[PDB]
Symmetry: D2
Subunit: 363 residues, 4 copies
């Protein structure tokens, strides 16, 4: 019943300013924070050996695309390794990102771990020494962070324990971040896995998000200095019943309106396995949904921004331009999508139409 | 993890429609839902015997005010007794209210009760047989209800227990109402008593509202079919620090923005002891606050709409027109206020 | 983090002394707190009109059995109506009970109500004006109360909401009772309905009781001044797998040891539809279970104490003695049962 | 409402057997799990350099005490470093402990961290990679673990957030331990600092423990395979009012009876700064308390078992015998205390709470 200010007005300002810059109108987030074990699978789909140099090269390819992506990218999330790598000109990647008007982000969680007594459910670890890590990342160029919690829809999931524990750990993570001048992006991802329908996903998403913001309140989190990275509300990947984009957008915006306080600066949707085109189209429909939306609705895509790029590159240093071009095309589409001004034409081959779904995704 | 629809699409539409009509642009709520005991002091201040007839005449006086109040009043809350009384011309009060474009509401709680083991804190009773009562009230003209929970800012209050229990009972009340086609207005009033400052009130209000909406979610409440009746964020009555109306507005809107889901159809502020003018000026500042507000910000005033009217009446029928005129002026004042058209570093919140 | 004493040392002593008397060694509770609607089908099975006089006569029949039942009955629970009725000698029933060494109890809940948004789940009502009711009941001879919450095991039940809400209302009820010198018996009954097995019931019972006691703590409830009336841990009524009395006893005692604080004065098991013999045999097994039990483990039986009595009566005044005889038999059987002395004649890590 | 067994019958048995062995009648726990930083203050108090060899020597001094301590010590908690050191004869310390009839324990938390938005309150870290650490410790001789959470009594503490968060992290720690065959000792220490009285501490202890067990239930913790290491219920250090040992015992036992399920195998009290003699007398009074106690009530002392031994040693090898004699005396005293058979001699109301 007594207030013990977690942050000073100056601290709040810095966080709010950072959060707003990332989701500035027309802008979204490039998520290239895949771990070595997670990116390896992608490099493998193109016969490219998962080496530190190939990873460096691939990341450089995305971070150094032409200036057309500048207005489209508000932030770029990187994995620890990449944050300390340098482009061919010797410029540290964080400096490369900043020079293009983007805010630098860092993934800080240490992956998921099983919750004993549950049916295959997990929570996420990574709080140990997080404060010191954030202080150092901040000094090295990062202004926001990423932490992923994973929930699954099933006959007995997500369970009461899974929802409570994951909401709590996200709150702890957000608290530590804000104490170090870092904007935490809260990611409580509900996997698309399963044959449940649209209304089922909407129900679970509303329950999960209510638990998340209650936890953030109990932990004294400054919402204006945070961002939310939720799954869009969609039917399960194996659901028979089909839905239009307008329906997906309606269920998504409705779930958010019922749980996300206006104070939250912005919502950066994860692609979650959708194709590059599907992610852009759904994001566009969301921004066009008639209902009132008090927060920026944009993107934080990993797979949905790199599909065509990875294929065009193929691990060949000579396919640089071609690869970068595919990325730029998806960044422009999503930049329009988060403004509701996107309308597919006919370009972007089958690559941008292929399902990027991966059962129990981990990165 | 599995859904069991509490409401059908038709029931949702009905609740949502009712909620939106009550807080439509420029409209607010007249709260004339005082019980015999709660109206006693006010009547005694004007030397008027607390009889059912005088109460009827007084309520009739407010409900029959001229058509100027029509665009100002979206809803009128009544106490059980008044819901079944008639005007001199024979028209049931509910009919009078509806003929003027207003939605009829009914106070359904049965007062506060002490919470053992706390420092003077309370919860509210009234859930027993509430479903049957709501069905009966609906049949008799009411479309929304009122339930008041009371919290106080003190050295050790509001306690975790008080916050949890009051939020839970509000959710129970909300669930029962929605099952009977009644839009529940949730009122978690934090009293202004004490010498605490603005920051303290904002902090406690944010914690209480966060608890309220988590409870509403746990009980599967359809937010679009509800309204929130909170205290504005202000310093305690005995606080020696002074604040401007703009600071009160900033603290109020910030608190709401951090806890009230956009899906909530509207916020109808209680006057909580503020004067008629103060309540209007504050509501006006709240609506002019630069921050984005996804919900209607209007009034649900009891005292702040009746002060001057009650005084002008003095319990004398000859003062009918004089009294109604006072009420009409406040109805017009607050209607402009809920639109920010009434004339008398956000990081720091 | 700051205490605001809900009860004084004197009030605590009163509640603790009452709770202990009810569950004193070898003693249990006769639950004759059925309402007109719940006793309806009961009297209906014996072709007896459901009138006030017949209900009065039947209650009189049980309450005035010979002194043999005295050491078997620590308490008797009555419904409002019966608390104000009198025996043929003009003595109010509360006095009849007390003169026989029993404590008088009164059922105070107002029945269950549906929880919207759940699959047929309920919570219970009756808190409105409960304090004034308790104050009056106290003056009229009652020293403890009964409040029943109902939970069911199903595909998605009991849900988080049902557990939380029922736990919370029981706490509110307990709080109000203790403020009026009435010992609250907390009854979070998990129905035996369904085909679930023993382990499932144990799991749900453990989770419900943990929720119940956390709620009692949040509401500042004085445990020594309360009693617990739970369901025994048993397989579902329609469970294909079969179990022994020893298995039921082990699951029951294990669930209690993992959730019920030692401070709780006693556990008074409900019969829950079990036959008179089964209820007694299981209670005996429970008391013989080779695990430590820091609280009295007795009975609070309604149906399992009246089944044979009701039948022997048949609604005829001439069968008075025969009917009481059957009741006495079940009273003696269960008195021995709560001591593990009843006879009709390890690997606890699996739980 | 559906069970998904965290443990098999075999796993439960292993955990239960270990827990009972630790708190067997007459036995307690020697807490020698001080880190280099925490043990630094104790070495400079006796003019001794804080080196790995000096710590090894000291730990060896306590661990190799004569067989008189065998029936007194059911378990010995060590710090990571010590778990991998060897006695002069080359025997690994865990082997020395085991051969004397003791169970080996390991401290696994990584210290406290500040909780933002609170008045100086903290939670505890150490969950990251804990499962792998436990598997390794189990393989290397440890059968139980220690994790310390710290709460403080003040004008606005312990706060709801602090209570909830610390209870939740203890549950996570307990869950990971049990998955790896390690018996978790849950330690929700409420510091004695402050001028609060006995009633205040009892109230806070009751609220904290209720939260702890609700969290353990939510996380499906197997209570029979756990132990509790709480603070005794006592007045604050700066409390003007004075209390007898019988009152402290009554307040402590009452608080435990109102919150700790009988399934919990044992309660091992921390000395929390009390003197060696004070800790023994209180432990004895606790065991003599008239109320029924369904769990073993013994000790898990660090300072209350090493105070004199450390002083007698003074960092000189010539005092090895004298230093061990001081430790042995406290082990014998507390062994009797956890049985209520302790007397100064040589081995020879209730509703107001």
């Amino acid at each position: 019943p007594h207030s013990h200010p977690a942050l000073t007005p100056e601290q709040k300002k810095e966080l709010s300013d950072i959060a707003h810059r990332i989701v500035a109108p027309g802008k979204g987030i490039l998520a290239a924070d895949e771990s070595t074990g997670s990116i390896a699978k992608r490099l493998q789909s193109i016969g490219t050996e998962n080496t530190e140099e190939n990873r460096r090269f691939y990341r450089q390819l995305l971070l150094t695309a032409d200036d057309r992506v500048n207005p489209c990218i508000g932030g770029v999330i990187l994995f620890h390794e990449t944050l300390y790598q340098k482009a061919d000109d010797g410029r540290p990647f964080p400096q490369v990102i900043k020079s293009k008007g983007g805010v630098v982000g860092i993934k800080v969680d240490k992956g998921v771990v099983p919750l004993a007594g549950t049916n295959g459910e997990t929570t996420t670890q990574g709080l140990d020494g997080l404060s010191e890590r954030c202080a150092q990342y901040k000094k090295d160029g990062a202004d926001f962070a990423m932490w992923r919690c994973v929930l699954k829809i099933g006959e007995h999931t997500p369970s009461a324990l899974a929802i409570m524990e994951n909401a709590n750990v996200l709150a702890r993570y957000a608290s530590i971040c804000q104490q170090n001048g870092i904007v935490p992006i809260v990611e409580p991802e509900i996997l698309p896995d399963g044959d449940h329908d649209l209304k089922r996903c909407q129900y679970v998403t509303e329950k999960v998000l209510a638990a998340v913001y209650k936890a953030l309140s109990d932990h004294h989190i400054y919402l204006e200095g945070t961002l939310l990275k939720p799954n869009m509300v969609t039917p399960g990947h194996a659901c028979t019943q089909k839905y239009s984009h307008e329906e997906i957008a309606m269920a998504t915006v409705t779930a958010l309106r019922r749980t996300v306080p206006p104070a939250v600066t912005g919502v950066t949707f994860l692609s979650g396995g959708q194709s590059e085109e599907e992610a852009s189209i759904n994001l566009n429909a969301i921004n066009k949904c008639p209902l009132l939306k008090p927060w920026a609705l944009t993107f934080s895509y990993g797979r949905a921004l790199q599909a065509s790029a990875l294929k065009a590159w193929g691990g060949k240093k000579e396919n640089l331009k071609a690869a970068q071009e595919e990325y730029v095309k998806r960044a422009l589409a999503n930049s329009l999508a988060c403004q509701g001004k996107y309308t597919p034409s006919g370009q972007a081959g089958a690559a941008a139409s292929e399902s990027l779904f991966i059962s129990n995704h981990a990165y």
